[PDB]
Design a binder for this molecule. Structure first.
Ligand SMILES: CSC[C@H]1O[C@@H](n2cnc3c(N)ncnc32)[C@H](O)[C@@H]1O
Lengths: 155, 151
């Protein structure tokens, strides 16, 4: 079981840095970032001190397709709890069974607008993190940390 | 029953704002902040719909005792970088059933204080990389709140 974190066009340096820290906290295997908008130099200040996750490990790609090659499963995320989208909808309780023995890309979208409908169409599953139904939209890095933690919660 | 989040001496405006957002995301009942160092005005920029949490809900104290009054259980989060009988977030549901609980998180750049430890009924660690076990404050908060909500 191998985990690739894919962050699509992150906008905030704090988010990018905080995600990089989480990659070390949770021993993520691969860290890909599509066309980052955030200033990488600024992001480094929020990453795990001495870790070089941004500097060395992080792989930048130009487009979505180059970040989702060579995996078994693509799990997109959304703050909207949804047809085709219901059909691919999952929850955190589902993850353990689905990712067993697989190389999985966990894909997160833009702070402004999320993932596009086509990015979701290209993904196998669409994960929603349960939260207040009246305000379920989590900040990007906090969503990432919750998902990564779910890979660790029985330690 | 009811859950009070207690954040001691937060330094980062981003962390404070992010925490306020999470309070709304996960319907935390009470929210206290002890001697904040962060600029609360700047923190609002990071709070999104949690701005109302900062406005109306957030209580500021100048000492720790005042932030942990009138609860049944105090649970402080730390890590092995800082600190047995420690617990994990999956243990929470059994411990807190039918109780008013304060969840205490400390200032980012320092370990739990002796006071915080003395006052705490349980010490909670988030399962993580032993070489890099320290989560950023607001991300630790989000994980714990998430587990409470999941339950
Ligand atoms: C603020 S939205 C930015 C990104 O965070 C993730 N996200 C935010 N909230 C949630 C949620 N409740 N469930 C799943 N993903 C989320 C999604 O990847 C989204 O594209």
């Amino acid at each position: 079981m191998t985990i690739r974190l894919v962050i699509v066009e992150p906008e905030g340096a704090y988010n990018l840095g905080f995600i990089a820290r989480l990659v070390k906290n949770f021993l993520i295997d691969e860290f890909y970032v599509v066309n980052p908008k955030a200033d990488i130099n600024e992001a480094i200040k929020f990453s795990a001190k001495g870790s070089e996750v941004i500097e060395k490990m992080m792989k930048i790609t130009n487009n979505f397709d180059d970040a989702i090659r060579d995996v078994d499963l693509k799990i997109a995320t959304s703050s909207i709890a949804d047809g085709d989208l219901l059909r691919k909808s999952i929850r955190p309780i589902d993850l353990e069974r689905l990712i067993k023995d697989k190389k999985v890309a966990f894909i997160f979208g833009r702070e402004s607008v999320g993932l596009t409908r086509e990015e979701i169409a290209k993904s196998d599953f669409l994960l929603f993190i349960p939260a207040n139904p009246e305000y379920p939209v989590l900040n990007l890095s906090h969503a990432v940390g919750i998902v990564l933690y779910e890979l660790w919660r029985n330690r």
